[PDB]
Write a protein that binds this ligand. Structure first.
Ligand SMILES: [Mg+2]
Ligand SMILES: [Mg+2]
Ligand SMILES: [Mg+2]
Lengths: 157, 145, 109, 121, 242
RNA sequence: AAACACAAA
RNA sequence: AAACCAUAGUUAUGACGAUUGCUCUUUCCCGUGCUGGAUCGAGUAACCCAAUGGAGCUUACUAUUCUUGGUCCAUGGAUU
RNA sequence: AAUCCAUGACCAAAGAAUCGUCACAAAUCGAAGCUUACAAAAUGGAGUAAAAUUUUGUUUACUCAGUAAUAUGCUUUGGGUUGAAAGUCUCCCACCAAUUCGUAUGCGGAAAACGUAAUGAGAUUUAAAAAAAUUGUUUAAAUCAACUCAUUAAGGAGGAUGCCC
């Protein structure tokens, strides 16, 4: 990998190291798609890697959905994000949480977004360069139907 | 029996020859500055006469006699500067070299001719032209951002 | 035995075993050898093998349409199968003098 | 322990199968692009609107890559859904010398998460 | 992919400083090249064998692709290479290549006398040999020196741009290209575009048809134009780095 | 062009 | 409103380069001979071309404008 | 009369094969294919390293599927396909214990203006060729060869004749 590009802008990231890319996703791509200032939402960020325990992740997630106080009128949304091959484990943990939560006669409303990092490698020859794309899946799950967030570019599920 | 035909697709490209003005370096910017438009004084008989003159001027007498047997311009419109030249499968190289050696129009100067697709039927030529037109719109939509 | 490179098999084909001296050449050809242009490069001199290396015959040689390559159904010797440390095997026709490379998988029938 | 895995139940009537590409773990990228373009061109002749792209397991990463390609390359609306797939596996249970394949086969369920990716025209 | 390695630089000597208009015209020409469809671009710079080479390393190349064309390289998506030709006439004021071969990438020569051909075939570490296609070729191209210079690796470069300038020199250009095709026996023939204005730029089909009607077979044209040009670029890069 | 016909020639 | 389907498929089946083999002629060797071997050379044919698939029949081809096998109460020369 | 040599006439068979190359996230003079979605890492995977926590539990930093996939690439063949693609020739390409060619008829064959076998005869004086298709000549007319028409139903058993015996 020679360089990492997002939104036609070069960034200083590394695909093999998960911490830097997860912090970049938490700090840049989420504020560029959702704004927590003009509304009354409590957003809980969570990134999933492939070395995380599924049961511990679910035990963190079922707590992160009931952290804010309910009396003042706060809508609590938890945004899970991952990239690359860790998206499989992310989906597994999301589906296990859905299975373990929907059993209590409740519903989880979900919004999905898919973007891409643009990385560059040196081709077979010395005069060729290949451009690879790494997928980025960001999901927002909440118990309430309507959210005042800018969710026009998401997918209602 | 069958008459072996071979149509030729060519494009008229105008290089932005202006050294006093600075230009934007990108894909769609240069695609638009090269595909601006064709002038009004552009038709089928004015391009056919020019290519017939250039053929005799470059090849000669017999080179024009062997090539001018089935040299016709089937489809051409000045809005997109796309033309289809019919010729034999024997004289395709001659017509291509003549289109390359095209210097200028008698009244319009500063232009080049680019042969894009050569095929032996008009349906594949139309399909390739539609594919190229669809490809052109992609960079335009991407750059309009 | 399936073809991993340029080649088309036919029925009544000959199955040879890769020798020991030119063992890295076929491995490099199976990994990749491209031109400065970028495309693949197989227009080279092939290391024609010896005669005492025929270990099988292809009975069903037809272009496989389910995978996009040339599938060869042959029968190789078990002693020669245990002899080689690799699964690489050369295929030749009855009239063609070219040797293609491939790898075989066991079938329990 | 010897255990074999069969494919998952696919119940598609006549047209869900046509406008749907099942991305394998060994399916190349360019062949997938070609098949997706063919499906996108043949949808409105089949009479549908979108193209389904189904992948599970190892092929999920390159399925999401296929989706992200047409996301910005052709500017076509994509929809990502997360579903569960149940697969039946035949396992051998301990209960002279018989063939390994001809033993006591018991069916066991296994759930896996997968991604469906719809692309509009 | 295509390779164009004969784009001239608007500067002959070292003393004359380049102007903004020349750089703008070169940018126009390179943009037209990329518009018609190309992958590799190697601009050429002409200099005389009698002109005094400077005793520098960081001043040998008055091109500076990184600060001038480095932004175009990132935006439009092509690459540029440095190439210098040697206009050699007499074996005097020379005997220096270890410093001119490391700075630039491709080293060419332009012999205009019978002794120049011998000096190019014998004692020059060059990759391509070009002639003055506009004017008359010096004495006569024979198989004797051409075979010995092609068997080692030196190819012959043909400038299809020189024909597009005027009407009279077309006859001399054709008489020289057919001569060099007959002498080279159609093995080591590389093609380049020596045009400084965007109005003399053509595509692959037209140039292929022209070189085919001039005497080169169809396989030779493509094989050479692609592979030999790519190999020359690779050999130049290897000479610069290791 | 090909391909068709209780045609037409 | 589709039934759209060819190990060519709808006026397409290109461009040259390289190798072996095939027919005659001017050469040298072992054993006479041997789809025995190597140089100096010429030629690779014609009818002619698919438009949904298969079978039968008839009709066009092979003279330095490639070839192969057999027959002839056809003639020409020689021996018994 | 036997054999050999050379020419001519007539019948019959087949239509040499192999390798490489041709710009554009798409291309070529064209075509097809690389889709029964999983690496038992979903019975809420397996472990290592640090802090704190009276073990659990929790927060950080890593390892494991490695025969691993490798970004418009990659493999294949295309005008006589088990010789005529040519031809204003024939026929199959739903069935019918039956007004539906219920046709056990020389043999093969679903059918065919279809192939072939034994014998006898024939030439506008003939069953029919001369004064539906096809073909420049377009069967024969000393003998041979070629065309046309007229008869010969399948299997088992007995006797006679001829051959090795
Ligand atoms: Mg026809
Ligand atoms: Mg007809
Ligand atoms: Mg016909």
């Amino acid at each position: 990998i020679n360089g990492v590009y997002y939104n036609e802008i070069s960034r200083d990231l590394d695909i093999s190291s998960s911490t830097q890319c997860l912090r970049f996703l938490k700090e840049t791509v989420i504020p560029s798609l959702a704004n927590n200032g003009n509304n009354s939402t409590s957003i809980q960020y969570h990134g999933i890697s492939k070395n995380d325990n599924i049961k511990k992740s679910v035990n963190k997630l079922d707590k992160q959905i009931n952290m804010a106080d309910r009396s003042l009128g706060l809508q609590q949304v938890v945004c899970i994000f991952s990239y690359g091959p860790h998206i499989q484990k992310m989906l597994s943990i999301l589906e296990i949480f859905k299975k373990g939560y929907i059993k209590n006669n409740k519903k989880i409303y979900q919004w999905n977004k898919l973007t891409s990092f643009d990385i560059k490698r040196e081709g077979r020859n010395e005069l060729q360069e290949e451009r690879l794309k790494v997928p980025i899946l960001v999901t927002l799950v909440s118990d309430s139907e309507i959210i005042d967030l800018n969710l026009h570019s998401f997918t209602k599920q | 029996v069958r008459l072996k035909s071979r149509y030729i697709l060519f494009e008229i490209i105008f290089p932005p020859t202006d050294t006093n003005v600075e230009e934007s370096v990108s894909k769609a910017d240069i695609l638009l500055s090269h595909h601006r438009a064709s002038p009004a004084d552009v038709s089928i008989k004015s391009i056919l006469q020019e290519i017939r003159r250039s053929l005799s001027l470059n090849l000669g007498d017999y080179g024009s006699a062997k090539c001018n047997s089935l040299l016709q311009l089937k489809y051409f419109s000045n809005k997109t500067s796309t033309g289809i030249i019919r010729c034999h499968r024997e004289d395709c190289d001659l017509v291509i070299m003549a289109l390359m050696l095209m210097s200028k129009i008698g009244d319009v100067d500063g232009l080049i001719v680019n042969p894009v697709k050569v095929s032996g039927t008009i349906k594949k030529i139309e399909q390739f032209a539609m594919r190229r037109n669809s490809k052109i719109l992609n960079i335009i939509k991407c750059s309009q951002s | 035995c399936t073809l991993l490179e340029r080649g088309h098999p036919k029925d009544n084909a000959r199955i040879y075993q890769v020798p020991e001296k030119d063992l890295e050449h076929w491995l490099q050809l199976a990994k990749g050898v491209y031109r400065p242009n970028g495309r693949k490069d197989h227009d080279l001199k092939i290391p024609l093998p010896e005669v005492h290396d025929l270990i099988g015959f292809i009975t069903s040689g037809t272009y496989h349409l389910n995978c996009g390559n040339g599938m060869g159904i042959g029968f190789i010797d078990h002693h020669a199968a245990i002899r080689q440390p690799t699964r690489y095997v050369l295929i030749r026709n009855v009239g063609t003098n070219t040797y293609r490379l491939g790898e075989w998988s066991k079938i329990s029938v | 322990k010897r255990v074999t895995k069969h494919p998952s139940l696919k119940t598609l009537t006549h047209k869900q199968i046509h406008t749907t590409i099942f991305v394998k773990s060994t399916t190349p990228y360019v062949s997938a692009l070609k098949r997706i373009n063919k499906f996108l061109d043949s949808v409105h002749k089949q009479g549908s609107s979108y193209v389904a792209v189904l992948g599970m397991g190892k092929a999920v990463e390159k399925t999401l890559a296929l989706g992200c390609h047409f996301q910005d390359q052709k500017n076509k609306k994509i929809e990502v859904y997360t579903k569960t797939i149940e697969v039946l596996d035949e396992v051998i249970t301990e209960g002279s010398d018989v063939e390994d394949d001809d033993k006591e086969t018991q069916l066991k369920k296994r759930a896996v998460s997968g991604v469906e990716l719809r692309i509009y025209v | 992919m295509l390779v164009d390695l004969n784009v001239p630089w608007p500067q002959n000597s070292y003393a004359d400083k380049v102007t903004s208009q020349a750089v703008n015209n070169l940018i126009k020409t390179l943009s037209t090249l990329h518009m018609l469809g190309y992958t590799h671009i190697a601009i050429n710079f002409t200099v005389n064998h009698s002109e005094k080479f400077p005793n520098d390393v960081k001043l040998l190349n008055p091109i500076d692709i990184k600060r001038r064309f480095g932004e175009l390289m990132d935006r439009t998506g092509l690459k540029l290479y440095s190439r210098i030709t040697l206009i050699i006439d007499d074996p005097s004021k020379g005997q220096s290549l270890s410093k001119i071969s490391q700075a630039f990438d491709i080293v060419a020569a332009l012999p205009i006398s019978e002794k120049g051909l011998t000096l190019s075939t014998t004692n020059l570490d060059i990759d391509l040999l070009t002639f003055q296609y506009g004017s008359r070729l010096p004495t006569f191209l024979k198989h004797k020196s051409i075979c010995s210079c092609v068997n080692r690796g030196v190819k012959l470069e043909i400038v299809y741009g020189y024909a597009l300038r005027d009407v009279q020199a077309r006859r001399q250009f054709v008489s020289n290209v057919r001569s060099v095709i007959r002498s080279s026996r159609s093995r080591g023939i590389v093609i380049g575009s020596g045009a400084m204005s965007p109005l003399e730029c053509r595509n692959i089909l037209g140039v292929t048809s022209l070189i085919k009607n001039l005497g080169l077979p169809s396989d030779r044209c493509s094989k050479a134009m692609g592979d030999l040009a790519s190999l020359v670029l690779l050999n130049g890069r290897l000479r610069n780095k290791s």
